[PDB]
Amino acid sequence: MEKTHVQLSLPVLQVRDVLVRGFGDSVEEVLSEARQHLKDGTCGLVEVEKGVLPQLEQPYVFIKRSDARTAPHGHVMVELVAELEGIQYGRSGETLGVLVPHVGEIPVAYRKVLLRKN
Numbered sequence: 649m650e651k652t653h654v655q656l657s658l659p660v661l662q663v664r665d666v667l668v669r670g671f672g673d674s675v676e677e678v679l680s681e682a683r684q685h686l687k688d689g690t691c692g693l694v695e696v697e698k699g700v701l702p703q704l705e706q707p708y709v710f711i712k713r714s715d716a717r718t719a720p721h722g723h724v725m726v727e728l729v730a731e732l733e734g735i736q737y738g739r740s741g742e743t744l745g746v747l748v749p750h751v752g753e754i755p756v757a758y759r760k761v762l763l764r765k766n
């Protein structure tokens with residue numbers, strides 16, 4: 649009975665602090681693990697700038713904006729899209745960041761999102 653969307657506040661991490669630099673070894677695994685870490689409260693977000701992606705591990709999981717009107721309760725509506733070797737699995741809007749495991753690193757901010765659970 650999972651609701652279609654969940655309001656989450658994600659810790660924003662600096663890339664050089666991240667200890668576990670991705671979720672796994674295949675597109676299906678990284679999407680699965682991302683969704684589990686989101687449910688457990690153990691997922692962080694790295695904002696993408698020059699130099700960030702080469703310091704993280706593929707496949708990547710991005711959170712991308714899913715619409716233009718829903719910022720319900722101050723949370724941007726987003727969905728997950730994976731990337732491996734330049735091919736994306738999903739099509740969505742602008743990237744808010746790359747998701748990574750959170751294992752206790754100190755964040756620099758929080759990003760409020762309304763996440764589509766599949």
Ligand SMILES: Nc1nc2ccc(I)cc2s1
Binds near residue numbers: 650654683684688766
């Ligand atoms: N299918 C499911 N994916 C997710 C993603 C985030 C959260 I919180 C719960 C679930 S259950």
